């Protein structure tokens, strides 16, 4: 009825209506960072998603 990954987590599931196996992937997660020239110089900044 279920699958589980080696991270102990429920990776996949059987649909009760269609008995079709479905794989889950979490909502996208992102690492965020900010770059600056130094406040005593300029305020334009660039952003980086890791």
């Amino acid at each position: 009825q279920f699958g589980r990954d080696i991270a102990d987590t429920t990776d996949a599931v059987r649909d009760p209506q269609t008995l079709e196996i479905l794989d889950i992937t979490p909502c996208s997660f992102g690492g965020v960072s900010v770059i600056t020239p130094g406040t005593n110089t300029s305020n334009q900044v660039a952003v980086l998603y890791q």
């Binding site: 009825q1 279920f2 699958g3 589980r4 080696i6 996949a12």
Partner: protein
């Protein structure tokens, strides 16, 4: 009129493993605790001849 004869014996050659759960697992090594048949154990044999 049947004849009866003392029990015979044989050996548990690594059988009696059964799925412990209804969960799909793959490419993995996993461990459990339950009732299972001990390997290499003296086990009884009967016949009807």
């Amino acid at each position: 009129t049947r004849t009866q004869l003392p029990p015979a014996y044989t050996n548990s050659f690594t059988r009696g493993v059964y799925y412990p759960d209804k969960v799909f697992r793959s490419s993995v090594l996993h461990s459990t605790q339950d009732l299972f048949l001990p390997f290499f154990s003296n086990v009884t044999w009967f016949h009807a001849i």
